[PDB]
Amino acid sequence: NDYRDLLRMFNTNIQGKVVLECALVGIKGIGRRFANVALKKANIDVHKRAGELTAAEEDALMKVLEDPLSHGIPAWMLNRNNDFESGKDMHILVNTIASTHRADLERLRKTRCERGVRHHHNLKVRGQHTKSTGRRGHVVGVQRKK
Amino acid sequence: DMHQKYTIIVVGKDLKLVERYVKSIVKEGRAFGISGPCRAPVRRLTITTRKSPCGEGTNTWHRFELRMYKRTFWVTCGGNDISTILSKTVVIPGIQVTVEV
Amino acid sequence: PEPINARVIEVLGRTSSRGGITQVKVEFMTGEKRQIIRNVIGPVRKDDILVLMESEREARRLR
Amino acid sequence: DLLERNDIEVRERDKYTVHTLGKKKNSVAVAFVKAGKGDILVNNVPLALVRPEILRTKVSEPIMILGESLFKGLDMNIKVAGGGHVSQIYAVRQAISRGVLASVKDEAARSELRAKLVSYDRQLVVSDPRRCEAKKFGGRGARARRQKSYR
Amino acid sequence: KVDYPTLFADEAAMNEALKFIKNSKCITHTQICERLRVSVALAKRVMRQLVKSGDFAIVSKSSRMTIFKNMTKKE
Amino acid sequence: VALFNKWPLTDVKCQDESLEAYISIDNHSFVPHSAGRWSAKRFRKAKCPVVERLTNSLMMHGRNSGKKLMAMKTVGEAFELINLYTGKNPVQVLVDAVANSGPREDSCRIGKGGQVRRQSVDVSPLRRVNIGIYNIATGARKAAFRKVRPFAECLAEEIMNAAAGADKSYAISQRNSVERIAVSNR
Amino acid sequence: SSVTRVPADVFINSFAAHLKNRGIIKCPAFTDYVKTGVSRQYAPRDADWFYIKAASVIRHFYISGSHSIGVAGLARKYSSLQKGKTTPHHTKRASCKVIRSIVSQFLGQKLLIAGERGRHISPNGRKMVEDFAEGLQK
RNA sequence: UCCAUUGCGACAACGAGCGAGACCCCGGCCGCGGGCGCCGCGGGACGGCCCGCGGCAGCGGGAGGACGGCGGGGCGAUAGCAGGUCUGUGAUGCCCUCAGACGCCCUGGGCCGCACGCGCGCUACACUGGCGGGGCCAGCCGGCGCCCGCCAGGACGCGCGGAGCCCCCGCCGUGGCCGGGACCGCGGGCUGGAACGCCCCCGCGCACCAGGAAUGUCUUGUAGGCGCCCGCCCCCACCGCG
Hints:
GO molecular function, one term (chain B): structural constituent of ribosome
Helix content of chain F: 40-55%
Strand content of chain F: under 5%
Helix content of chain A: 25-40%
Largest interface: C-F, 26 and 27 residues
Oligomer: part of a larger assembly
Order of helices and strands of chain F: HHHEEHHH
Organism (chain B): Giardia intestinalis (strain ATCC 50803 / WB clone C6) (Giardia lamblia)
GO cellular component, one term (chain B): cytosolic small ribosomal subunit
InterPro entries (chain F): Ribosomal_uS7, Ribosomal_uS7_dom, Ribosomal_uS7_dom_sf, Ribosomal_uS7_euk/arc
Radius of gyration of chain F: 17 Å
Shape of chain A: elongated
Order of helices and strands of chain A: HHHHH
Number of helices of chain A: 5
Number of strands of chain A: 0
Structural class of chain F: mainly alpha
Family (chain B): Belongs to the universal ribosomal protein uS10 family.
């Protein structure tokens, strides 16, 4: 078996043990909206060593991620359905996840709102469980300027 | 005689009261070809309220249950004959008699 | 040195202050008929063979 | 499912000669016997077919202890409704064993043959009084309570 | 903190394991994998090929446990 | 020949007189599911078949609690493995193991009066069987956490090694440890 | 009957291999992409999941027969619970669209002809499915 | 002696009583009438008998036997407590606010804010576990169909109908893991005057790798494990009665 461990793509090492499927959801997690709805099949083998997979199969896989709609993946699997930008449905890849997170957080700051104060002050947003639940780590409403 | 089929249904809280009304309908109907009485599965009406009006104490709860038993009697008779049967039947106040044509 | 087989001729009473212990009157299953009360834990009934004893330790009937 | 007229509701005509009830853990199995060609099928399903394959060996206990000439030829159609899964198998086992007993019928010492089956398996002829108990106020389950904070 | 996850090139590694299987009288599906440095998924496959060969005999069949002893191990 | 169509229940013998009446190998249904309400009465280990008593003992740890069926399977796979480990009767290995894993010597405090220092006590000949079926299983359980070995073979490791007077299983190293507690606290 | 004697697992797996040669039903693409159920953790990896489901519905259908099983009815045979939440899990249904295609496709092959409350097998189908069982046992 | 002044003996006490019992509710089983909905009415295990001891009441070991000497429940004395509730009320005393009202309507809040600390819960830490399709199974006592939509749901309708765990073969190495499911971006909806409620789909992979003192709660269908229904409710269960 030419298991071929590593075979890193997208600046993220993979494994000679991981099946061809977990290898993408395990591409840092960031960069793969998973549930393997299309990932389970794609054109790649269901259950084999992920290094053994041929480059040609990997390259076709890279293309299906690059244009999800062309593969035939339904829009619901993809993450950015409507987009607040040019409003165009798009997938999110590894680097864009944290760039888009900056886009979501920095937009929040420029458009001041309760949902932004509940992130700049580090309060958990939505749940309102900053009352009696998360002693955990000290990520709770504290304060002490003077 | 336009022999209509009548279904008679009786819903009552007390078994002692229900059996007496059931016996009268069977007793009155021997002349009119009465089908024997059908006993319903008990209809439980449980209500559970913590007994204490205030919140003090290990809440203890009152399970208040009302049992409904319904009785089905099929009769094939004229519209008047049930009325003649009615005078003979002993009427217990508040017990319900349902005439289903 | 071997645990000596014993015959539980009869069960006496439950003691130890928690009732846990049930000291029983015993006799030797193997030996010149040595018979002495011994301290037992767990369920015991007459004619039981207790093969878990060193013989020297001696218990008593006052309780 | 629950004490209905399902005793014979499914089958019309071909009156099956024997009617024998078997019950374990709220599971009702009425055994119908026609003394045929070795049909021990219960729930219109083969004896070998079972929810737990390992459990089937227990339901073959009259077959091993009592003569096989009995099960060599018989006919069966059993309506089992109710029970989680394993409750159904012991109820089935009560049904079929009583069904074989009902077939012996005429020999007066039918009980003596049946008691060899009781001696190997008690409750194979008897129904248990074990039934689910109820919770009470302050109790998550039948025999417990919310954990008490102070003794 | 690891073993040999997969990496089963079928050359001398694969020949050593079935010869190790020729050394061990009885084999357990999870047991061989840590007996000879490999993952469980590899363990069932070679034994199935030994079953295809007829050099492996099964006694218990279940999703959780499959056990194999060589048919010709008595040699 | 009534145990999984193998391992005859009749073949098993009382190797030890230490516990005889309590071990019951006379009335076992093949694959002893034996759900039979043996909770009433204080003296009936005859009513609880030893293998099925072990069945009850094997389900535990909260997650597997209630799963008596997962024990009937556990015993069968270990017994096949025991047959593959030694051509002897696996139920006989069970009689030897339960006799060899329960404590000969224990010491409760038994301070009848005031001060409590553990006092040496010979165990009841019924008590030893109950703990042995508890310790053997718990030997597999103790090492059933991240072990590569499945629980069934974990149990098969315990019964066979502790079956003779050799001690490798946690269960027998418990009997020897408590025996030592009752040699010290004499 | 031998259709009650063919173990359900054996019947369902064996029936779909010749159904593959048959070309009956024709499992669509979006369905083979989607994960069955609204409670399933992730998609089943059977690949031929739609074809394997088709051998599952028509066998339970033989027992149901005249009483009939609607779209919810076959979802009932494969009903599951979510395994991943901090709070306890309340039982929920599987996906309606995948089930609605499997017996609607089966109506098309004429093995199932249905016109009652939800769906019933055409006698030709009941006989033929039973005939596959007749081959399966003996 | 009994859970129990529960008795049996004996006694300046002698008779009564009220608690406990009895009784009622549901099962253990059967019989008679019946019946759609198996459901109404009876009976029945009586410490009866056996053996040992018992002044005797009782007391073990027993067998038959649906069941062993209360089935699972309710109702519960005298006497109290400065316990709780004036915030359920046509239960209300005194005392207050009585029209710029503590009256009564609308509109937007808040109880969903909130270091740490707790008082219950819930899900985990995987290997008897996952996650896998796919054989299923109830008992509360409950309605379904068809068609689009991944679902969420929506339309069009007809009155009609059932769990999970587990059990299947599989996929899977001891990897904070394909353990766990947090936090949290992106959409699809629901219903409501209105989400700030909720669910589904798709990211994401928090802590946590067996829990220190110190604690609870329980002996058979019991503990635990695993699901259903209701109470409240447009919305929404981890809660409680079952």
